[PDB]
Amino acid sequence: MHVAQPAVVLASSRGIASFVCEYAATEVRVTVLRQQVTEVCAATYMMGNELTFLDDSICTGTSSGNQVNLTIQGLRAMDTGLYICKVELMYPPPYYLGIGNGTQIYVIDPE
Amino acid sequence: MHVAQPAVVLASSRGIASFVCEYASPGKATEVRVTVLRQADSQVTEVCAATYMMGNELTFLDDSICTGTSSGNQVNLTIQGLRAMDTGLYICKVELMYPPPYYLGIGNGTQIYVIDPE
Amino acid sequence: LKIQAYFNETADLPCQFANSQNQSLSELVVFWQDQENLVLNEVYLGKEKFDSVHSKYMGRTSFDSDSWTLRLHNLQIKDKGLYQCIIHHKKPTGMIRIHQMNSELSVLA
Amino acid sequence: MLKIQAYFNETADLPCQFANSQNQSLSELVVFWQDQENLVLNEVYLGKEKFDSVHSKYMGRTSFDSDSWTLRLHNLQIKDKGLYQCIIHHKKPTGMIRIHQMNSELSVLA
Numbered sequence: 001m002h003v004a005q006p007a008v009v010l011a012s013s014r015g016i017a018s019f020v021c022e023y024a025a026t027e028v029r030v031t032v033l034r035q036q037v038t039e040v041c042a043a044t045y046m047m048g049n050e051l052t053f054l055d056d057s058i059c060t061g062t063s064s065g066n067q068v069n070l071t072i073q074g075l076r077a078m079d080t081g082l083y084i085c086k087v088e089l090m091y092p093p094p095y096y097l098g099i100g101n102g103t104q105i106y107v108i109d110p111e
Numbered sequence: 112m113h114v115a116q117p118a119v120v121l122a123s124s125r126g127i128a129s130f131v132c133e134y135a136s137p138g139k140a141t142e143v144r145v146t147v148l149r150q151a152d153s154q155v156t157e158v159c160a161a162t163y164m165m166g167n168e169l170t171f172l173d174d175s176i177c178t179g180t181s182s183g184n185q186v187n188l189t190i191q192g193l194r195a196m197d198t199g200l201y202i203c204k205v206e207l208m209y210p211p212p213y214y215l216g217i218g219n220g221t222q223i224y225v226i227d228p229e
Numbered sequence: 230l231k232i233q234a235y236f237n238e239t240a241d242l243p244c245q246f247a248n249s250q251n252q253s254l255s256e257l258v259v260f261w262q263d264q265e266n267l268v269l270n271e272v273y274l275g276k277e278k279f280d281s282v283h284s285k286y287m288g289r290t291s292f293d294s295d296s297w298t299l300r301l302h303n304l305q306i307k308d309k310g311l312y313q314c315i316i317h318h319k320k321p322t323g324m325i326r327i328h329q330m331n332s333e334l335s336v337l338a
Numbered sequence: 339m340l341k342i343q344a345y346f347n348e349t350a351d352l353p354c355q356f357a358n359s360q361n362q363s364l365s366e367l368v369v370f371w372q373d374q375e376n377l378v379l380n381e382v383y384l385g386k387e388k389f390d391s392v393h394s395k396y397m398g399r400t401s402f403d404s405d406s407w408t409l410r411l412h413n414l415q416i417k418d419k420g421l422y423q424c425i426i427h428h429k430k431p432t433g434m435i436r437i438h439q440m441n442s443e444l445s446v447l448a
Contacts, residue, residue, distance in 0.1 A: 010224055011227075012227060013124065013227050013228070106119075109121050110124070
């Protein structure tokens with residue numbers, strides 16, 4: 001497969017960073033990593049519906065073919081880092097695991 | 112004349128970015144002149160510049176937006192009142208004037224992300 | 230895992246899975262695919278859907294819910310390849326993969 | 339009535355011949371197949387597949403096709419040569435009720 005996302009992005013003054021992660025059949029699952037390397041948030045969504053991410057999570061995504069707009073919230077200075085956007089292609093088979101090189105989110109700068 | 116500075120930097124919410132530009136010093140009392148540049152798409156222009164002895168405060172007569180101090184191999188620069196559009200590759204050039212010999216060294220520029228006012 | 234079968238005979242592609250959190254094929258989805266991301270058999274939430282089964286595998290496989298394996302019948306001279314078993318756990322939160330094992334298939338002519 | 343011949347070590351299609359009229363989903367239906375000896379091949383309970391009551395000889399060599407309701411039996415043996423019947427109940431809340439039962443013969447050409 002092949003996941004690619006924005007080269008670089010800069011969160012707003014309130015802590016809202018939103019990039020566009022796109023992959024190359026209907027129930028996809030984007031897992032947001034972070035470079036150690038740990039899990040920020042994740043979800044499973046149909047072809048073109050709103051993502052979920054539990055409910056107490058810090059992400060909010062929408063999607064529509066090839067890509068999905070993610071939006072991490074409540075970010076701060078220390079958060080800044082390479083946020084890798086992984087994309088798995090679940091049911092229906094065949095599987096497919098594509099990983100991006102991550103978009104660098106620069107937030108080191110609170111109010 | 113290798114000049115190297117911070118990989119990338121992000122100005123605070125007020126527009127205060129501050130990097131460390133360090134060069135290979137001279138083995139004899141000497142006058143250095145640091146000039147801070149900046150590239151847009153490619154239009155390269157002068158932000159500010161100062162001439163300072165070995166280890167004293169930079170006197171930016173320019174009255175510009177620069178306030179730096181120095182002490183062997185490196186000078187701490189501090190550009191002020193930045194905004195969203197400023198954000199760019201601020202190249203930090205270092206010239207080693209009198210006494211001879213000369214020496215022109217340039218950095219690959221520290222990337223100052225500011226695109227984010229209050 | 231490498232397993233040999235003879236031409237026109239059958240082959241047993243194990244999944245190697247070993248249910249830990251004891252689950253039924255209902256709250257799970259199981260399929261197998263080859264070196265080309267094609268599909269052999271699929272066991273959806275308990276049933277067996279062929280909606281996305283490749284022609285070459287259709288009508289020549291069978292699930293053995295017992296050993297979580299999968300017999301592939303009437304072997305050809307093309308089946309000689311690498312197959313992988315996968316198992317997702319369709320929770321409410323969404324399907325998550327929970328297992329994936331590979332196997333090599335040598336068809337002795 | 340409807341006999342179907344299959345070769346030794348090949349596969350055989352035991353059809354159910356059912357013909358959904360009151361269009362029902364395999365969920366509100368229970369389907370299974372059996373031989374001359376009241377043995378069980380494959381079962382389709384309220385939608386899923388239950389192997390709880392499946393004989394060892396049939397296990398791991400059969401496969402339901404909800405499309406044609408049929409049931410392929412793999413790696414035929416010299417003993418499968420027999421008569422099989424497809425059944426379909428209708429699990430109502432009142433209780434299961436039979437709604438279909440068709441018979442098919444199996445000749446295994448060796």
